């Protein structure tokens, strides 16, 4: 029957209380329907973004980070690239769109989508073995080991986009994390008068839905 109860005479710095209007008897300029209204920060993370898969120790320029190299000369069993899915701590995905949104939260889980698009000559053909390792599993060390697991044989000739929806993507705050590896299966074959190099670009998204809980400040830009 009182409002002088303990804990109700303070500034709690997260008040939802209403407060006096500084200047009433002032008309605001009514809102205009501007294109592209945003309702969640999750909409931002559901937009595909070029991830820098290549980011070798000695990197001459910063625009070769988005290019995974593929060449004519290279053995039939050789590894193209390796990734560790952990889009919040792994260096590859750290500064992508998906990475930035995630780092403002302390708990998150869901699925992500990885599209691999071959950007190269229109006359090249070959096959690859995009292989996926479950969270607990070790990355395969040979193409033969990789093939036993979950694998998609991506034909560069008949397709040029391979979309992989990956589940069990969680915060994990070494670590249990999935792995996506890719292996030569046939090598790149070209006819006369065609370059001897091509590249593969990679994209990442936040798939159908993700859930983020509890705000936190970014550990990027320092105060």
């Amino acid at each position: 029957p009182t409002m002088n109860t303990p804990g109700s005479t303070q500034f709690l710095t997260s008040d939802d209380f209403q407060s006096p209007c500084a200047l009433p008897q002032f008309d605001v300029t009514p809102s205009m329907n501007i294109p592209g209204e945003v309702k969640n920060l999750m909409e931002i993370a559901e937009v595909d973004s070029v991830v820098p898969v290549n980011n070798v120790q000695d990197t001459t320029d910063q625009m070769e980070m988005f290019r995974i190299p593929v060449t004519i000369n290279a053995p039939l069993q050789q590894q193209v690239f390796g990734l560790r899915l952990q889009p919040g701590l792994d260096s590859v995905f750290k500064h992508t769109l998906l990475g930035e949104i995630l780092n403002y939260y302390a708990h998150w889980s869901g699925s992500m989508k990885l599209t691999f698009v071959f950007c190269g000559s229109a006359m090249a053909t070959g096959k690859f073995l995009i292989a996926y390792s479950p969270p607990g599993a070790n990355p395969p060390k040979t193409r033969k080991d990789a093939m036993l697991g979950t694998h998609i044989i991506w034909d560069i000739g008949l397709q040029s986009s391979c979309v992989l929806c990956v589940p069990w993507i969680s915060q994990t705050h070494y670590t249990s994390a999935g792995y996506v590896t890719c292996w030569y299966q046939t090598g790149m074959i070209v006819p006369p008068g065609t370059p001897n190099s091509s590249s593969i670009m990679c994209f990442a998204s936040a798939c159908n839905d993700f859930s983020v809980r509890m705000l936190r400040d970014t550990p990027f830009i320092s105060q």
Binding site: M32, I34, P35, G36, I44, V47, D48, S49, V50, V51, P52, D61, Q62, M63, F66, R67, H95, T96, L97, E100, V117, F118, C119, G120, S121, A122, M123, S160, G193, T194, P195, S197, S198, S199, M201
Partner: protein, 241 residues
């Protein structure tokens, strides 16, 4: 096959990526402030043809300053004061099947770009100057009166990989060769002076460098065709008593 578009000039071509799902439209679809829609402005104002060489970095054109010297549109910018317009941009390149390369055609609304030297000012002739494709450069820029122009940060400090938020279309030479981006009018004021404010900046960024094999054409010509659609202006005549 070929859906020949006619307006007052013809452009033969053969997806449309709408800016945000909003088509250009008159402000009248919503005395003191009368308006004067000019319906003769639209037509394909084809810009100059840049050469995509092997050692190139990227290009940008400020709008609506690119069309400041282009016909009727150019004239109206001088005459009239307040005006609003939307644009249909067709970026087409022509290349064989022995050429390999990738481009990111992106329309960036309101891009403020920092100076090359931190804490210095630069002239308006360093961003736009009629119809010119200003060139991004590799590494830093140390010329004081220039824009920063470092490709990897896109000259805005945002990281070049993340430009995919904005309405963008990828021209992968392997398959397609055309990009149509229909940009609507986006501003916080109904209509604005077309000299003061550069509404959006079109950037074409090669993500994979051109490799042309041997004894083939050493450049791929990229042509930009802009048609201003649904352009409205302000009345120049007095109201009734």
């Amino acid at each position: 096959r070929s859906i020949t578009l006619g307006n007052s000039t013809i452009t033969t071509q053969e997806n449309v990526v709408v800016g945000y799902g909003r088509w250009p439209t008159y402000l009248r679809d919503d005395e003191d402030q009368p308006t004067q829609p000019d319906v003769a402005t639209c037509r394909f104002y084809t810009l100059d043809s840049i050469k995509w060489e092997k050692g190139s970095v990227g290009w940008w054109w400020k709008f609506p300053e690119a069309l400041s010297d282009m016909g009727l549109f150019g004239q109206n910018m001088q005459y009239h004061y307040l005006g609003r317009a939307g644009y249909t941009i067709h970026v087409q390149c022509n290349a064989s099947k022995f050429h390999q390369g990738c481009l990111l055609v992106v329309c960036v609304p309101e891009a403020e770009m920092g100076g090359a030297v931190v804490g210095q000012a630069f002239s308006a002739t360093a961003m736009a100057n009629g119809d010119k494709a200003y060139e991004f450069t590799s590494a830093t820029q140390s010329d004081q009166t220039k824009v920063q122009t470092a490709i990897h940060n896109a000259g805005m400090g945002v990281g070049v990989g993340n430009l995919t938020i904005y309405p963008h279309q990828w021209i992968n030479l392997r398959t397609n060769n055309s990009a149509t981006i229909v940009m609507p009018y986006i501003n916080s004021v109904p209509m604005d002076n077309m000299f003061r404010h550069y509404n959006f900046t079109l950037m074409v960024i090669p993500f994979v460098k051109l490799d042309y094999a041997d004894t083939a054409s050493t450049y791929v010509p990229i042509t930009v065709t802009v048609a201003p659609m649904c352009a409205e202006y302000n009345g120049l005549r007095l109201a009734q008593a």
